[PDB]
Design a protein around this ligand. Structure first.
Ligand code: HEA
Ligand code: HEA
Ligand SMILES: CCCCCCCCCCO[C@@H]1O[C@H](CO)[C@@H](O[C@H]2O[C@H](CO)[C@@H](O)[C@H](O)[C@H]2O)[C@H](O)[C@H]1O
Ligand SMILES: CCCCCCCCCCO[C@@H]1O[C@H](CO)[C@@H](O[C@H]2O[C@H](CO)[C@@H](O)[C@H](O)[C@H]2O)[C@H](O)[C@H]1O
Ligand SMILES: CCCCCCCCCCO[C@@H]1O[C@H](CO)[C@@H](O[C@H]2O[C@H](CO)[C@@H](O)[C@H](O)[C@H]2O)[C@H](O)[C@H]1O
Ligand SMILES: CCCCCCCCCCO[C@@H]1O[C@H](CO)[C@@H](O[C@H]2O[C@H](CO)[C@@H](O)[C@H](O)[C@H]2O)[C@H](O)[C@H]1O
Ligand SMILES: CCCCCCCCCCO[C@@H]1O[C@H](CO)[C@@H](O[C@H]2O[C@H](CO)[C@@H](O)[C@H](O)[C@H]2O)[C@H](O)[C@H]1O
Ligand SMILES: CCCCCCCCCCO[C@@H]1O[C@H](CO)[C@@H](O[C@H]2O[C@H](CO)[C@@H](O)[C@H](O)[C@H]2O)[C@H](O)[C@H]1O
Ligand SMILES: CCCCCCCCCCCCC
Ligand SMILES: CCCCCCCCCCCCC
Ligand SMILES: CCCCCCCCCCCCC
Ligand SMILES: CCCCCCCCCCCCC
Ligand SMILES: CCCCCCCCCCCCC
Ligand SMILES: CCCCCCCCCCCCC
Ligand SMILES: CCCC[C@@H](O)[C@@H](O)CO
Ligand SMILES: [Ca+2]
Ligand SMILES: [Cu+]
Ligand SMILES: [Cu+]
Ligand SMILES: [Cu+]
Ligand SMILES: [Mg+2]
Lengths: 256, 535
């Protein structure tokens, strides 16, 4: 399996897309980026031009005007136009994002201090996920020879430290995975940048997100609501595998 | 002597606010240096559990020197304490005390031709409540707290159940600190509003009042509504911690999300309470150094009023991922977009005010122009975040951090600097040396961009907020960010040098108005400094 959903050295862009929702985010952000770069360049050039053109040495007698009705109309309407154009593309994407479809696969996720509990109610499977390197795997949240050995043994390298967990949420490719997210003690937040998903894990509340992974591989997330001493140290690993390998994984957990 | 502290005069209190705000600013900035020392490279080198076993003082000095990873047990709690200390000091005990309590108290009365604030002893009280609040916040850092250590590692917004279950009484001290702060701001707002309304000099009409005085006025209203709400929110935390209530605890029927609604109901107004006085300062400064009058005076007042009121119906944009419905998410998205119009428009008015002028590039004007660049960079980034679909990705990442440091932190800071250089002559009778002011500007402007622009890349790559340590791939831009923060720190130390120099041996100020005719508000008709009893 290829490591796809992760940060890359010196990166300035998004993490690779692996879901149709992620792709919409990449697209909507890239669209707004062009606009906001234009506004920024525009405002910057105006400021630099005015400072050059109207410098005291170059312009000795100041104008006295405090009005320009046509310009004030234009400069109000145009911003309003820009925002409506954005919303026109933005709202459908939001609607696609928050309307939870019918599940092919259902995982219930619970945040704890400081690890993640996974449960597959249709399969009677459940387990906990700890960062490789945490007290659970014998570490104390830092890199060491032991932690590097444990990362290799598990199919990773020392570059995935802080992202890699001892167990993964395994799901099939091209299937609608619905994830139900809650918290057991304090608030956490469950996220996978590559899927374009993030949902706070709030005690007393059960919330839902959805994704459909479009390619196989490994994808990481990190707890995204400050939750105590090991907030930096309770990541998420999702392995997207074929329909057959997913069943194989399922059967490996079946108690006979 | 001590006297200073017992004075009731709006000029003396403004000075006290400015100095105290500056010292607390120094402390909070020092915290950020330490933060950036740890974020400079992957792996934990500074915040080691091993330092806990030493005394407070020896432990302090050991933690300023890096250790090998193999000798350094990561202490996540110290990170979380620093971050919380940094944020709380800035948001309650630094920028508002300096802009509102500082320049507000000094210059608003002079702007409107008032002799003093309506309630002078109440103004002296507000200062003391600020100091008491600062003391309690600092004290919380040294009080028993989370995970059997000192200090509260809970984030400046104190979300439960994390905040309500933090061990010790450090969190209670921090809640008290915030009560005292709000009290301080409430008194100040009463005083500003009453003065603005009852004590304008004969002839001074609402439509003839200077923009700085307006910005202070609107700011004072937001305080009166916002701060009592926060006081509710945090008392509920106090009762959940000490008096068996369960407002935010599910096992008693509570909802932690309820706190967020209430906190953010204050929390957004809070960000406008911060910049509005800076809006005021930028207007006067640009008018003066463009030698032009303010473009669209009346639309500016209305824009400021609009923003002030609309900033009360946008809060839940801080909550897109807290589990709000599609309908709530959509409403708040559109409310946020509407408030973006009069906010972004004001950039145009300031450019229009420069346009056709006779521009003099003195230090105060540099700060003002910097404000325009940074406010814009921050604002466009808010545009992105307002789209809940995209906030999904960015929420609780360094992209948000970059946003608010550009639009909010630096906006306020550039406003504060513009004001200080604009008015130090007036307040002290001594002038700053022009070359040093310019040097401070360029260092600060280069440094602040190096610090915060690369945090946009970190957010995009998925780096979460409030992390002591990060995956290897985040290393490069974290390194650049930390170098920028060290350069910014040097710019600030140099600034403290410039201020010390100015106050003790700066060129004597000779004129009432040492700028020009277009510095046309009342303080420029008075001496430098003004008389003890003015008007
Ligand atoms: C100075 C205070 C300040 C200001 C003015 C703003 C301005 C804006 N803010 Fe920012 N905001 C903060 C302070 C501020 N913010 C803080 C402190 C936080 C986080 C706190 C925390 O979590 O600890 C935050 C976080 C925050 C979030 C939540 C992020 C998250 O946690 O996920 C959102 C979501 O919509 C948002 C939106 C916006 C928008 C749309 C604007 C707009 O009003 C900006 C207006 C636009 C511009 C100024 C651009 C220039 C425009 C023009 C030149 C012309 C106009 C053009 C158009 C409108 C197209 N902000
Ligand atoms: C106005 C508010 C303000 C200001 C000025 C700053 C200033 C700075 N901030 Fe801060 N920041 C916050 C408000 C502010 N911050 C908040 C609310 C948070 C969130 C806390 C939380 O997560 O709970 C945060 C969090 C935060 C983070 C993320 C922490 C994390 O998630 O782990 C980082 C990362 O580097 C950071 C860095 C810096 C740096 C390097 C500076 C500075 O060093 C930049 C350089 C600027 C200067 C050197 C000038 C300083 C001058 C003054 C402050 C004026 C002093 C007054 C007078 C002179 C009268 N800050
Ligand atoms: C969204 C982008 C925002 C960019 C903002 C910066 C651009 C500002 C341009 C200012 O426009 C000026 O307005 C004046 C007032 O309306 C005009 O004066 C005209 O009207 C005056 C008012 O009576 C007369 O005194 C003048 O002689 C006459 O030229 C002048 O021509 C025009 O250039
Ligand atoms: O206005 C709303 O705009 C939405 C976005 O434009 C529509 O959602 C519509 O469009 C979305 C995006 O194509 C779909 O996900 C929804 O199912 C569909 O109801 C929705 O009806 C409409 O009231
Ligand atoms: C018939 C009645 C049954 C009797 C009950 C049996 C008692 C079993 C004790 C289990 O206690 C566990 O102890 C861990 C170690 O002390 C805790 O880890 C916690 O502390 C670790 C080390 O500090 C962190 O790394 C973890 O993330 C954090 O969960 C964990 O929470 C807690 O559940
Ligand atoms: C008649 C009596 C009935 C018999 C059954 C006994 C009931 C057991 C009490 C459960 O409460 C536990 O208390 C621990 C002690 O505080 C906690 O450990 C916490 O505190 C420790 C520090 O003392 C840390 O080492 C752990 O990591 C941390 O989980 C633990 O989480 C919590 O569940
Ligand atoms: C770091 C914080 C920023 C500080 C900048 C503010 C400077 C204001 C200092 C003014 O001090 C003045 O000094 C005068 C004698 O020279 C006194 O007579 C006057 O009463 C007093 O007000
Ligand atoms: C004037 C501004 C003052 C700012 C202080 C800046 C101090 C920075 C010290 C840098 O120390 C480095 O820390 C790294 C790990 O972080 C080590 O790996 C590296 O070998 C070491 O050299
Ligand atoms: C794949 C490279 C993408 C580079 C995009 C960088 C965008 C930085 C966002 C900052 C916006 C400031 C106006
Ligand atoms: C159907 C698109 C509507 C977007 C409205 C945005 C509000 C602009 C102010
Ligand atoms: C206990 C260590 C705190 C270090 C603070 C540096 C400023
Ligand atoms: C072999 C150790 C490398 C030396 C690094 C020096 C650290 C200097 C930090 C001092 C900063 C004080 C604010
Ligand atoms: C690749 C862009 C570099 C920008 C540096 C921050 C200023
Ligand atoms: C690696 C050392 C960087 C030190 C920067 C000091 C300014
Ligand atoms: C693929 C194997 C399916 C086995 C199935 O019965 C279990 O997942 C449910 O207990
Ligand atoms: Ca480090
Ligand atoms: Cu967590
Ligand atoms: Cu967390
Ligand atoms: Cu807000
Ligand atoms: Mg969050």
């Amino acid at each position: 399996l290829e490591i796809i959903g992760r940060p890359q050295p010196g990166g300035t862009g998004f993490q690779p897309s692996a879901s149709p929702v992620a792709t919409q985010i990449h697209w909507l952000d890239g669209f707004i980026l062009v606009i906001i770069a234009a506004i920024t360049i525009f405002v910057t050039l105006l400021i630099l031009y005015a400072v050059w053109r109207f410098h005291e040495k170059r312009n000795k007698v100041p104008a006295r005007f405090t009005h320009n009705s046509p310009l004030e109309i234009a400069w109000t309407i145009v911003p309003i136009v820009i925002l409506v154009a954005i919303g026109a593309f933005s709202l459908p994407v939001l609607f696609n994002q928050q309307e939870i479809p019918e599940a092919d696969v259902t995982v219930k996720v619970t945040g704890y201090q400081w690890y993640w509990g996974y449960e597959y109610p249709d399969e009677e499977i459940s387990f906990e996920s700890y960062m490789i390197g945490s007290p659970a795997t014998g570490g104390d949240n830092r890199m060491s020879p032991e932690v590097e050995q444990q990362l290799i043994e598990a199919g990773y390298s020392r570059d995935e430290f802080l992202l890699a967990t001892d167990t993964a949420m395994v799901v099939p490719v091209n299937k609608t995975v619905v994830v139900q997210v809650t918290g057991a003690d304090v608030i956490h937040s469950w996220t996978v940048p590559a899927f374009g998903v993030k949902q706070d894990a709030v005690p007393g509340r059960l919330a839902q997100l959805w994704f459909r992974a479009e390619r196989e591989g490994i994808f990481f997330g990190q707890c995204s609501e400050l939750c105590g001493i090991s907030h930096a140290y309770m990541p998420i690993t999702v392995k997207v595998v074929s329909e057959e390998a997913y069943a194989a994984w399922l059967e490996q957990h079946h108690h006979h | 002597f001590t006297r200073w502290f017992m004075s009731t005069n709006h000029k003396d209190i403004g000075v006290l606010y400015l100095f105290t705000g500056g010292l607390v600013g120094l402390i909070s900035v020092a915290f950020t240096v330490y933060m950036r020392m740890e974020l400079m490279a992957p792996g934990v080198q500074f915040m080691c559990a091993e330092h806990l076993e030493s005394g407070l003082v020896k432990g302090f000095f050991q933690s300023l020197w890096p250790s090998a990873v193999e000798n350094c047990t990561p202490n996540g709690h110290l990170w979380n304490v620093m971050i919380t200390g940094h944020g709380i000091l800035m948001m309650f005990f630094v920028v508002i005390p300096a802009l509102f309590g500082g320049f507000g108290n000094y210059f608003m009365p002079l702007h409107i031709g008032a002799p003093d604030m309506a309630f002078p002893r109440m103004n002296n009280l507000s200062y003391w409540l600020y100091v008491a609040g600062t003391s309690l916040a600092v004290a919380s850092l040294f009080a028993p707290g989370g995970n059997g250590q000192l200090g509260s590692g809970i984030g400046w917004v104190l979300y439960p159940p994390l905040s309500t279950s933090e061990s010790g009484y450090s969190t209670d001290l921090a809640i008290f600190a915030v009560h005292l702060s709000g009290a301080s701001s409430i008194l100040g707002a009463i005083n500003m509003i009453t003065t603005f309304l009852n004590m304008r000099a004969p002839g001074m009409t609402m439509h003839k009042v200077p923009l700085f005085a307006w910005s202070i006025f609107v700011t004072a209203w937001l305080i009166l509504l916002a701060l009592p709400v926060l006081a509710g929110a945090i008392t509920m935390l106090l009762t959940d911690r000490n008096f068996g209530t369960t407002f935010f605890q599910p096992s008693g029927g509570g909802d932690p999300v309820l706190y967020q609604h209430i906190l953010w109901f204050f929390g957004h107004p809070e960000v406008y309470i911060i910049v509005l006085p800076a809006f005021g300062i930028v207007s006067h400064v640009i008018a003066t150094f463009a030698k032009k009058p303010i473009f669209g005076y009346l639309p500016m007042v209305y824009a400021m009023v609009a923003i002030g009121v609309l900033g009360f119906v946008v809060w839940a944009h801080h909550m897109y991922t807290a589990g709000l419905s599609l309908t709530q998410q959509s409403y708040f998205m559109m409310a946020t977009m509407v408030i973006a119009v009069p906010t972004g428009i004001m950039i145009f008015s300031w450019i229009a005010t420069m346009w056709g002028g006779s521009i003099e590039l003195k230090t105060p004007m540099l700060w003002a122009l910097g404000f325009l660049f940074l406010f814009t960079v921050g604002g466009v980034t808010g545009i992105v975040l307002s789209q809940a679909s995209v906030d999904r990705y960015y929420h609780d990442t360094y992209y948000v951090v970059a946003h608010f440091h550009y639009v909010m932190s630096l906006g306020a800071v550039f406003g504060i600097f513009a004001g200080i250089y604009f008015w130090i002559g007036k307040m002290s009778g001594r002038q700053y040396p022009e070359w040093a002011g310019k040097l401070h500007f360029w260092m600060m402007f280069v440094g602040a961009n190096l610090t915060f622009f690369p945090q946009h890349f970190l957010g995009r790559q998925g780096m979460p907020r409030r992390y002591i340590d990060y995956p290897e791939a985040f290393a490069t831009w974290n390194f650049v960010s930390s170098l920028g923060a060290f350069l910014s720190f040097a710019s600030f130390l140099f600034f403290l040098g410039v201020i010390f120099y100015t106050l003790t041996r700066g060129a004597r100020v000779t004129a009432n108005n040492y700028w020009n005719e277009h510095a046309d508000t009342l303080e420029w008709t008075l001496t430098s400094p003004p008389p003890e009893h003015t008007f």
